[PDB]
Amino acid sequence: GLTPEQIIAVDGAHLWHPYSSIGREAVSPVVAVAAHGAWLTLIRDGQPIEVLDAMSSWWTAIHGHGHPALDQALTTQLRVMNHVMFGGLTHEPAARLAKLLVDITPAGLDTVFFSDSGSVSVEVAAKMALQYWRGRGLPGKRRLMTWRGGYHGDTFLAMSICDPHGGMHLAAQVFAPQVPRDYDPAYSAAFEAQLAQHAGELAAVVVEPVVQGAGGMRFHDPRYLHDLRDICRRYEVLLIFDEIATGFGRTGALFAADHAGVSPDIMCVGKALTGGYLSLAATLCTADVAHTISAGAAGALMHGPTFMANPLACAVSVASVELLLGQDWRTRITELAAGLTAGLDTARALPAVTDVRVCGAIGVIECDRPVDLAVATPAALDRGVWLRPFRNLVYAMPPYICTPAEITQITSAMVEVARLVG
Amino acid sequence: GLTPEQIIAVDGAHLWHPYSSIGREAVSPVVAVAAHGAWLTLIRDGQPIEVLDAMSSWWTAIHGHGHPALDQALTTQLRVMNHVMFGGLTHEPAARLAKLLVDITPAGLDTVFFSDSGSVSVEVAAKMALQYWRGRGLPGKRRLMTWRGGYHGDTFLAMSICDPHGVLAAQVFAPQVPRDYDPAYSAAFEAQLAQHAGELAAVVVEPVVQGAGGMRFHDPRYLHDLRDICRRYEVLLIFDEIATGFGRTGALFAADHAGVSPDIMCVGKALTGGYLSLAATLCTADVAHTISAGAAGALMHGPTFMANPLACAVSVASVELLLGQDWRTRITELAAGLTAGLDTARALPAVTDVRVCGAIGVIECDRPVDLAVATPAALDRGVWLRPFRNLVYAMPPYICTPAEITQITSAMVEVARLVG
Numbered sequence A: 001g002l003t004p005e006q007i008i009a010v011d012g013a014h015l016w017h018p019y020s021s022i023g024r025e026a027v028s029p030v031v032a033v034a035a036h037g038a039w040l041t042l043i044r045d046g047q048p049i050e051v052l053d054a055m056s057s058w059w060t061a062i063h064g065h066g067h068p069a070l071d072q073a074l075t076t077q078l079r080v081m082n083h084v085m086f087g088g089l090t091h092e093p094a095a096r097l098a099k100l101l102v103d104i105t106p107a108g109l110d111t112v113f114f115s116d117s118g119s120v121s122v123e124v125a126a127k128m129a130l131q132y133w134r135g136r137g138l139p140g141k142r143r144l145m146t147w148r149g150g151y152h153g154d155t156f157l158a159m160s161i162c163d164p165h166g167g168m169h170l171a172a173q174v175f176a177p178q179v180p181r182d183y184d185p186a187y188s189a190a191f192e193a194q195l196a197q198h199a200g201e202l203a204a205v206v207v208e209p210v211v212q213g214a215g216g217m218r219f220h221d222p223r224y225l226h227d228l229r230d231i232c233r234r235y236e237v238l239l240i241f242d243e244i245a246t247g248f249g250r251t252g253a254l255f256a257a258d259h260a261g262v263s264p265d266i267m268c269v270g271k272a273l274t275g276g277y278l279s280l281a282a283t284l285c286t287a288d289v290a291h292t293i294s295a296g297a298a299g300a301l302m303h304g305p306t307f308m309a310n311p312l313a314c315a316v317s318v319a320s321v322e323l324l325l326g327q328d329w330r331t332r333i334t335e336l337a338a339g340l341t342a343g344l345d346t347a348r349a350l351p352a353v354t355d356v357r358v359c360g361a362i363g364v365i366e367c368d369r370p371v372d373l374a375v376a377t378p379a380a381l382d383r384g385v386w387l388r389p390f391r392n393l394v395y396a397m398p399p400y401i402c403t404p405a406e407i408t409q410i411t412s413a414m415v416e417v418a419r420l421v422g
Numbered sequence B: 001g002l003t004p005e006q007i008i009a010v011d012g013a014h015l016w017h018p019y020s021s022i023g024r025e026a027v028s029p030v031v032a033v034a035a036h037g038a039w040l041t042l043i044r045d046g047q048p049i050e051v052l053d054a055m056s057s058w059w060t061a062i063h064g065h066g067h068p069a070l071d072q073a074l075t076t077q078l079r080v081m082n083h084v085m086f087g088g089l090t091h092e093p094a095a096r097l098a099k100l101l102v103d104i105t106p107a108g109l110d111t112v113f114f115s116d117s118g119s120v121s122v123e124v125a126a127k128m129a130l131q132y133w134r135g136r137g138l139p140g141k142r143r144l145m146t147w148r149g150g151y152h153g154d155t156f157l158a159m160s161i162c163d164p165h166g167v168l169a170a171q172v173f174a175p176q177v178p179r180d181y182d183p184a185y186s187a188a189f190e191a192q193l194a195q196h197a198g199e200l201a202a203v204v205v206e207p208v209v210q211g212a213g214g215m216r217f218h219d220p221r222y223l224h225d226l227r228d229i230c231r232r233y234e235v236l237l238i239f240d241e242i243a244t245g246f247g248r249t250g251a252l253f254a255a256d257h258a259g260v261s262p263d264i265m266c267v268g269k270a271l272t273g274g275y276l277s278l279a280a281t282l283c284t285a286d287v288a289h290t291i292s293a294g295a296a297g298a299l300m301h302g303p304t305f306m307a308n309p310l311a312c313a314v315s316v317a318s319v320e321l322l323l324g325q326d327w328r329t330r331i332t333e334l335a336a337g338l339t340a341g342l343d344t345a346r347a348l349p350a351v352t353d354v355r356v357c358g359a360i361g362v363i364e365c366d367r368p369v370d371l372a373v374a375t376p377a378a379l380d381r382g383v384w385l386r387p388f389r390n391l392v393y394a395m396p397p398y399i400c401t402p403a404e405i406t407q408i409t410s411a412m413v414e415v416a417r418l419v420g
């Protein structure tokens, strides 16, 4: 056991944090001691306080923390079978989860490859695309194309398709310009012309549909995805959708691809898949992709993580997916978006604010200058909210269980850090 | 809910398995329905059968399945806090685990970066090495060197240091390290490293045991040589202990057989006792401080589920359970049982070698082992074995009794007998 003071001492000496230093941290981490529902208990000045998890712990906690149905699914599975190797063995949690994911994802995605993290699932999707074209006798189709503004994880291949300026740029991939928010057919015509020149060396287009999360919380018209589907079909390039942040209702559709009625050839999901309990991700592909890989000289997808298809993670994901589908989740997200829109409207008039935008249960204030976390974090904590701004963005992706009142507290805190920026 | 028959139906239609095809698998998976201690319950011909998990579920289940101390650590943490983002927050399970890992790993490893899988932890170690030399103003030091026979995961950078014969970055490979110590091999490794030193960020190897690449063992004195070569030529040394850690080779970490400390080390697999995916990359203070003072100012990596409290809490319990008992005597007794039980295999006509290292036992055969013959032969004897290439091997849970070890080795000998 450790007191909060001892936690901070160990942390400062021995723990790396995301995109951080050791011993140069201008702001040291805050100790979290409990989480329940939409609330985190954090230690502030040696006193525990409850604050709203406005970020859903980086998009994961869609049902909140410690939801009784998800806890019970985990403890039920734990009593039976914690984990067995997926080499030569299968089990009921993987089968239940695979069946669910195939039924609820865009039509045509009928096979499921489980992995342990989103970045790995993106690498599996790339491996699938590359082995597909090798199986078609076109091994020159080796590169990936994307548009700027994206984020796909931190492994070396995933990094090669992240926005180059938001990754300090590895494989040299093809980047189209930033897709705009409002639909401009000239953008799609130019994307096509750029892809056409590279078609013979391109295995896939990879994009985040409708919402680009970690790269800038930018939204784009779903009609762009119909254009990509059509360009990819006409030029013999696969289409991969990275729905690791957008899946499971977040943008108001079950998957963002559903806003456009398009099906990619390959899709990645993660994050909210387990309700934020455990790391799990999945890469889905069409029957054609699967059969082409399996019929190639290679004969098999050469990927297999040790903890593939972990029964505990699958069991809680089954419960999390069923809990979502068993409720009127579509109405719940619409009400969340309306609450975010009403709460963030005051921000439109603030002098440091450039844009306010909402899409499903995602709210964003974009500012004209970086927001200083040394100012933003205490301002938000004083208002009972945990917010984590980055670059010039103050944003929220709240749990689906937040009441109207909790949304008022979250948006009030966002507007106030925006007011403090100017 | 699904019966076993329905599980097999869904599985065959919708689930990819490791290193497999869809619809072309000559062998379909067996349904597992329970696991307790060293035993799995599998469905065979519609009936449940108990079999020993001789593989510890791919090296992870060192305390067996459903151990009460690990079950309870997980449920205790579940009642408090499932998960919080590690960006701007810290918590007691991560701190308790980092404190443990720093104290039990080779000396000088003082900082801990948690990730969700072994493959990712290997890429973090490569990122640490590359950012280290950039922080020293030597960004030409960009490549990795290893010896043949290795395996480090399936992500694209990890694949680049896998044995090429068993789109990728072009790394530097020394020949297969032999089992017996030969100073000529170390001299040749040194001569090859010397030619590339100005472009090498790190040497990366699995110490003492190379697992997935062939279950090959090598004399620990080679690691003393690598440490000295790396120190003299200013190349970082990275040990991948994802399979060898936590007592498996008879020492707590295989590097301890040599008394060597690398600059960077990866651990995983048995870290959680086989409950949950977790991995960690450790580095010295000097590596950490050089990266933090570099133009970057930070290690540019950070997975969503970094330092997951549930995974950390169960790992803390697994490590403390291992340290709280006389694990060294346990592993010596397990190794003695494997040696005694596998001795009969040496004289079999298809067997090329029998070798044991700690709680690892290997029969190397003169032909690839046919899983369609080996798997029922092993199940008929109450043992789950998963051969690969020409190897029949076991890495059993540390809780196996002498009789269970004898049952495992008797089953291994019998599949080896069937190969010829």
Ligand SMILES: Cc1ncc(COP(=O)(O)O)c(/C=N/NC(=O)[C@@H]([NH3+])Cc2c[nH]c3ccccc23)c1O
Pocket: A087, A304, A305, A306, A307, B018, B019, B058, B117, B118, B119, B120, B122, B151, B152, B153, B154, B206, B211, B212, B213, B240, B241, B242, B243, B268, B388
């Ligand atoms: C030292 C080290 N470094 C990194 C990693 C990656 O770690 P991760 O999987 O991403 O968590 C590992 C993972 N080893 N995994 C296995 O041995 C199993 N797949 C069994 C396995 C080994 N040969 C095989 C051949 C065919 C089928 C299964 C297997 C590691 O041993």
Ligand SMILES: Cc1ncc(COP(=O)(O)O)c(/C=N/NC(=O)[C@@H]([NH3+])Cc2c[nH]c3ccccc23)c1O
Pocket: A018, A019, A058, A117, A118, A119, A120, A122, A151, A152, A153, A154, A166, A208, A213, A214, A242, A243, A244, A245, A270, A390, B087, B302, B303, B304, B305
């Ligand atoms: C669509 C999609 N695809 C793949 C992955 C990889 O997923 P994984 O992390 O390997 O499981 C994710 C992960 N998003 N992660 C987060 O939002 C933050 N933790 C990262 C994060 C927080 N500040 C940052 C500043 C700069 C860059 C990244 C970050 C994803 O959104």
Ligand SMILES: [Mg+2]
Pocket: A102, A103, A104, A105, A106, A107, A108, A109, A110
């Ligand atoms: Mg379908």
Ligand SMILES: [Mg+2]
Pocket: B150, B151, B152, B153, B154, B158, B159, B160, B161, B162, B163
């Ligand atoms: Mg490898």
